[PDB]
Design a protein around this motif. Structure first.
Motif, PDB file in Angstrom:
ATOM      1  N   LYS A 352       0.828  -1.178   0.000  1.00 53.50           N
ATOM      2  CA  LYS A 352       0.000   0.000   0.000  1.00 53.50           C
ATOM      3  C   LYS A 352       0.866   1.233   0.000  1.00 53.50           C
ATOM      4  N   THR A 353       0.331   2.302  -0.567  1.00 51.81           N
ATOM      5  CA  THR A 353       0.942   3.608  -0.458  1.00 51.81           C
ATOM      6  C   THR A 353       1.055   3.955   1.033  1.00 51.81           C
ATOM      7  N   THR A 354       2.191   4.528   1.431  1.00 47.83           N
ATOM      8  CA  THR A 354       2.392   4.980   2.811  1.00 47.83           C
ATOM      9  C   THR A 354       1.926   6.419   2.931  1.00 47.83           C
ATOM     10  N   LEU A 355       0.959   6.671   3.810  1.00 45.96           N
ATOM     11  CA  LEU A 355       0.452   8.034   3.994  1.00 45.96           C
ATOM     12  C   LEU A 355       1.591   8.980   4.358  1.00 45.96           C
ATOM     13  N   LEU A 356       1.660  10.099   3.640  1.00 43.44           N
ATOM     14  CA  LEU A 356       2.677  11.136   3.879  1.00 43.44           C
ATOM     15  C   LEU A 356       2.060  12.258   4.704  1.00 43.44           C
ATOM     16  N   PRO A 357       2.892  13.067   5.397  1.00 43.39           N
ATOM     17  CA  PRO A 357       2.377  14.221   6.150  1.00 43.39           C
ATOM     18  C   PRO A 357       1.713  15.216   5.242  1.00 43.39           C
ATOM     19  N   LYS A 358       0.813  16.012   5.807  1.00 41.40           N
ATOM     20  CA  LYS A 358       0.081  16.994   5.009  1.00 41.40           C
ATOM     21  C   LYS A 358       0.978  17.999   4.289  1.00 41.40           C
ATOM     22  N   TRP A 359       2.173  18.278   4.823  1.00 42.15           N
ATOM     23  CA  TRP A 359       3.028  19.264   4.162  1.00 42.15           C
ATOM     24  C   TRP A 359       3.418  18.840   2.722  1.00 42.15           C
ATOM     25  N   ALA A 360       3.433  17.534   2.466  1.00 46.96           N
ATOM     26  CA  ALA A 360       3.760  17.032   1.127  1.00 46.96           C
ATOM     27  C   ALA A 360       2.745  17.466   0.067  1.00 46.96           C
ATOM     28  N   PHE A 361       1.556  17.866   0.507  1.00 54.74           N
ATOM     29  CA  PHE A 361       0.447  18.224  -0.381  1.00 54.74           C
ATOM     30  C   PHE A 361       0.266  19.720  -0.657  1.00 54.74           C
ATOM     31  N   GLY A 362       1.196  20.524  -0.152  1.00 52.73           N
ATOM     32  CA  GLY A 362       1.256  21.936  -0.478  1.00 52.73           C
ATOM     33  C   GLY A 362       2.219  22.159  -1.640  1.00 52.73           C
TER      34      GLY A 362
END
Ligand SMILES: [Ca+2]
Ligand SMILES: [Cl-]
Ligand SMILES: [Cl-]
Ligand SMILES: [Mg+2]
Ligand SMILES: [Mg+2]
Length: 1059
Positions: A352-362
């Motif tokens: 599975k994809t490993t959830l990344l921290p929200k900062w990766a989505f900015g």
């Protein structure tokens, strides 16, 4: 002086060295040629081949002169043709005038031919696996094919051509019906029909619908062997109808539908022309078909997928092998509840994809030219001055460019014996006088930083003490791969980082050493991850790794071992660390972000990037990025920059980057530099709009990131992934789904402003202005250079972080620790439900449900306990009242009053949105909007004939009204949906008619009626007339015409459909 021959060269798929054997792996009946070189060029040279066939000495074969090039002579020796089973061993030799002889070899090959499954002779059902004993078309093997279930909807096939290996157990939830001519295997999700003579498999869903099947003439499954020492390839062949589409295969730049192509599962570093060459950095032996199945060939060896490329109705795979007769063919046919569930099942197998921290989505900011502290400070100041609240920051040109773990210009006492440095071992100078302080400044701006890396130890032939020390240690410790002779493996000289030594990422001790050298960057400097570039660097069949695997098997796996090793290392120290990489194979998805690599600043390259993202998505690589508007070539035009910005803001990962190391003027693809280079000041507000919109949608985007990690559903998806039966969606590559609800249609063609958007059946609402678009056709949408068509599907519940202005495109900053106004945009349609990932408040899942009941003029919202005040924005007409837990809440007359209130409601007449504010409470709250209907269909958004629009009489809904509708041949057409299914409805027509009574002729899907619109007191007075209509499923064409028998002028505000 010398001689040289090496049969496989570097084992490159696309080219040959000039001293190879052709064919590399000879089959029966193929003429075998040996290409040999000698040097220097001179008279009297003799070249020949000493060899044996099945141990019998043969007469020498003399080589003939072929051509001269450089300092060398090239020669060809012809060994002739062979029969299956022949074992050939040879040594190539050269000498001048009978003097010193030079030689290469001995080299051995085993001549093969194909053997296929013939009939099933017996079936053995072991309860958790089935064995099919079979006969073969040739040879003396006793093949066995094992069937097992990874799950009730996921079938695994394992073939042992010799029958000496055994398949793996799977689930026991299946039944078998075994007859003399056929065996049928059934689960609650699948029906597998297998004819016995000849053997042939058909995979059906439980209800009988065919998913896929082996090719009609059978003998489909086969292996390439000499019958004694080697199995070199496997194949299977399948029947495919003319309309079947095939998606995925990793990241592909040429097309999203591979029908008609031979697809190579082979990682490669191809600069700029990936689409034209049909190459990729990220290759995965998995595809999804719109016929509702996926196929995954479980092997790291190169495979070729022939997708109706040879025979119109056949697809096949050909899988390589290293000759080991004990390596079984292992593949899966994957079904599921829907196409995204197919991808989920694939990730059950490969990770599975490993959830990344929200900062990766900015937004991520990057430029290769940033090579000193002052560049970082200036980049941060430029972002602040231009109101660009980015969250990611990349440095490429940061190191000594020798060791790649030491800051440029730093001084120190060199270390021996592989010892690692600490921060205090360095004296920091020149370009980087205080790396820790620089990182603190990046953090202070609300950004996180990653440093560029490669998997190879650079060896440029120059003297550089620390690198030389590390190289000697790495070699003597056995930390490199081996070339096959006991020497360390080096990247071929002509390639990127040629002569460099690869770190063997299969060797845990080697990895611990390599990462120990970078430890201080995480523990003391404080970085937030690595941009792990490269990895497409394993050539050579004899290249040998610590795990015992060799170059053929490891080429595709190596980049993922590399990427995963770093990702896991960084996260072990910094839980918030993120990797950013380009290469990999199956399982890459476990380890961070993947970007589409090196492309030019053109619309053609933009088109290719989008295909790369859409194919990667299907292949389970969801956290995908691209260098928005291209990283190299001539600077992007303002048009390209703007079009790219809009797509980038609505893609999984938004990131700008540039290739040049020291250009003048700057090549930064930043918005401020883009304004500077193009002279177009409007680039800045346009970029701001898209960035601010992405940050407004961050709660939705991050929930989608979580859904990837939990349920295998990619963030950005090709249309057929959500609509597999829709024939219009099959080949679309210029629109996509983003999250569960948004249909995004970027403009990827130069000079285009009339954008065609295919809308599947169902209702779609323009998120920017409330325009309603019933689906079931391809619409035309006028999109100027600053505009991106984006639509929400019926029933969507979309969380947003809004300012007190409550409009999309308003800056909420980059605070990831709190919301400003947490808002849920709702397009009510039947019963809908959404699980919001509330990461701000501990990562709790908040289940929101909406129940639309427009037949009774109600919409109900069941809000769970929330930590924050919440605002609903419900698409509807204006309520007569709104209750929370059965108590009325107050109507606010203005947005200002709404903002001051603690609970209440407010109606936005421009957007046709009812805002409802509910306080934070530790228990569920029931919100009910009373007296509401489906939102109006604004006349000003209709298809107009010889009429214009205006906003010069107050009280209209939307942005205005149709004006001057007062003469024959004029018309307003609306595309309207039946609200609650096909039925009779009342159509409320809102208009003004200040001078006299008017009449118009209305056609509903071609059915005529005339209506009367009584005079209003004046042009500032609106009235509504109720018209009975019959509305059917799909789009209803509603035309208001002024015919010869009609009369008078009206202003036309909107129509509302109600019970
Ligand atoms: Ca209007
Ligand atoms: Cl049997
Ligand atoms: Cl009215
Ligand atoms: Mg499943
Ligand atoms: Mg930290």
């Amino acid at each position: 002086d010398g001689e040289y021959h090496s049969p496989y060269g570097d084992d490159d798929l696309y080219t040959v060295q000039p001293t190879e054997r052709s064919p590399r792996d000879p089959k029966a009946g193929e003429d075998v040629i040996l290409n040999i070189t000698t040097w220097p060029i001179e008279n009297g040279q003799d070249v020949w081949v000493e060899w044996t066939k099945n141990g019998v000495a043969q007469e020498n074969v003399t080589a003939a002169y072929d051509y001269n090039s450089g300092n060398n002579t090239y020669w060809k020796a012809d060994l002739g043709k062979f029969e299956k089973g022949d074992e050939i061993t040879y040594t190539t030799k050269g000498s001048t005038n009978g003097g010193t002889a030079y030689e290469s070899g001995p080299f051995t090959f085993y001549v093969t031919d194909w053997e296929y499954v013939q009939d099933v002779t017996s079936v053995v059902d072991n309860g958790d696996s089935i064995t099919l004993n079979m006969t073969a078309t040739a040879g003396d093997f006793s093949p066995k094919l094992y069937l097992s279930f990874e799950d009730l909807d996921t079938l695994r096939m394992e073939l042992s051509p010799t029958g000496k290996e055994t398949g793996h157990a799977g689930k026991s939830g299946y039944t078998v019906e075994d007859t003399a001519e056929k065996v049928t295997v059934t689960t609650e999700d699948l029906s597998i029909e297998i004819q016995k003579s000849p053997y042939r498999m058909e995979v059906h869903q439980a209800d009988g619908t065919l998913l896929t099947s082996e090719y009609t003439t059978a003998n489909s499954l086969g292996w390439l062997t000499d019958g004694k020492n080697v199995i070199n390839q496997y194949q299977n062949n399948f029947m495919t109808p003319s309309d079947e589409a095939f998606y995925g295969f990793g990241e592909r730049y040429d097309t999203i539908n591979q029908r008609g192509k031979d697809v190579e599962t082979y990682v490669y570093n191809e600069y700029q022309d990936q689409a034209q060459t049909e190459r990729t950095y990220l290759a995965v032996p998995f595809f999804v078909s719109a016929n509702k199945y996926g196929m995954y060939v479980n092997s790291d060896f190169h495979s070729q997928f022939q997708m109706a490329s040879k025979v119109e109705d056949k697809y096949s795979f050909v899988l390589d092998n290293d000759g080991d007769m004990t390596n079984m063919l292992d593949y899966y046919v994957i079904s599921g509840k829907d196409q995204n569930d197919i991808v989920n099942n694939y990730t059950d197998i490969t990770g599975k994809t490993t959830l990344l921290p929200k900062w990766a989505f900015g937004l991520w900011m990057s430029a290769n030219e940033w090579d000193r502290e002052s560049d970082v400070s200036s980049a941060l100041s430029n972002a602040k001055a231009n109101d660009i609240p980015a969250t990611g920051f990349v440095l490429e040109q940061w190191s000594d460019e020798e060791t790649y773990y030491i800051w440029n210009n730093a001084t120190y006492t060199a270390k021996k014996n592989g010892e690692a440095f600490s921060y205090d071992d360095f004296t920091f100078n020149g370009k980087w006088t205080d790396p820790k302080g620089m990182v603190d400044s990046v953090h202070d701006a609300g950004m996180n930083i990653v440093l560029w890396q490669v998997p190879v130890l650079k060896d440029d032939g120059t003297v550089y003490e620390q690198r030389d020390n590390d190289e000697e240690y790495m070699i003597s410790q056995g930390y490199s791969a081996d070339d096959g002779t006991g020497a360390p493996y080096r990247v071929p000289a002509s390639q990127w980082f040629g002569n460099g030594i690869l770190l063997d990422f299969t060797n845990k001790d080697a990895v611990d050493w390599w990462t120990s050298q970078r430890e201080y960057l995480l523990t003391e400097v404080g970085i937030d991850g690595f941009k792990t570039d490269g990895g497409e660097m394993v050539w050579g069949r004899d290249t040998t790794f610590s795990n015992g695997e060799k170059g053929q098997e490891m080429r595709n796996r190596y980049p993922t071992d590399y990427v995963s090793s770093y990702f896991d290392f960084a996260k072990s120290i910094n839980p918030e660390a993120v990797s950013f990489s380009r290469s990999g194979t199956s399982g890459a998805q476990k380890s961070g972000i993947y970007w589409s690599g090196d492309q030019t600043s053109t619309f053609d390259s933009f088109q290719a990037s989008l295909k790369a993202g859409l194919s990667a998505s299907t292949s389970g690589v969801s956290y995908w990025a691209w260098d928005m508007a291209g990283f190299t070539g001539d600077y992007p035009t303002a048009e390209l920059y703007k079009r790219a910005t809009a797509m980038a803001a609505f893609a999984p990962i938004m990131q700008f980057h540039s290739e040049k190391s020291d250009p003048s003027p700057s090549e930064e693809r930043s918005p401020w530099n883009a304004v500077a280079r193009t002279g177009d000041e409007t680039i800045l507000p346009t970029f701001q709009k898209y960035l601010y919109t992405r940050m407004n949608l961050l709660p939705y985007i991050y929930t989608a990131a979580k859904d990837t990690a939990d349920n295998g559903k990619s963030m950005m998806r090709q249309m057929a992934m959500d609509y597999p039966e829709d024939v219009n969606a099959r080949d679309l590559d210029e629109q996509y789904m983003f999250g569960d609800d948004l249909l995004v249609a970027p403009i990827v063609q130069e000079g285009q402003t009339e954008k065609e958007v295919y809308l599947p059946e169902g209702e779609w609402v323009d998120i920017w202005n409330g325009g309603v678009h019933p689906g079931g056709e391809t619409i035309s949408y006028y999109a100027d250079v600053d505009t991106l068509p984006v639509f929400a599907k019926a029933g969507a519940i979309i969380p947003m972080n809004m300012t007190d202005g409550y409009q999309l495109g308003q800056n909420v900053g980059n605070d990831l620790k709190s919301y400003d106004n947490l808002t849920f945009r709702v397009y009510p349609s039947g019963d809908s439900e959404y699980s919001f990932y509330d990461d701000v408040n501990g990562g709790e899942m908040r289940d929101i449900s909406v129940s639309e009941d427009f037949a009774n003029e109600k919409v109900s919202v069941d809000l769970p306990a929330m930590a924050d005040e919440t605002t609903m924005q419900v698409f509807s007409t204006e309520p007569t009242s709104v209750t929370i837990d059965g108590a009325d809440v107050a109507k606010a007359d203005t947005l200002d009053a709404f903002n001051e209130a603690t609970t209440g409601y407010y109606y936005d007449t421009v957007q046709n949105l009812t805002y409802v504010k509910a306080a934070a409470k530790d228990a569920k709250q029931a919100i009910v909007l009373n007296g509401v209907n489906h939102a109006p269909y604004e006349a000003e958004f209709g298809h107009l004939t010889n009429v214009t629009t205006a906003s010069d009489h107050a009280g209209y809904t939307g942005t205005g009204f149709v004006a001057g509708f007062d003469a024959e041949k004029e018309a307003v057409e609306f595309d309207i949906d039946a609200v609650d299914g096909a039925s009779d409805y009342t159509m409320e027509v809102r208009y003004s008619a200040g001078v006299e009574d008017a009449t118009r002729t209305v056609y509903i899907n071609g059915k005529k009626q005339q209506i009367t619109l009584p005079k209003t007191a004046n042009w500032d007075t609106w009235n509504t007339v109720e018209v009975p209509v019959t509305l059917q499923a799909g789009n209803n064409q509603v035309v208001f015409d002024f015919e010869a028998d009609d009369t008078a002028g009206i202003n036309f505000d909107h129509v509302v459909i109600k019970k």
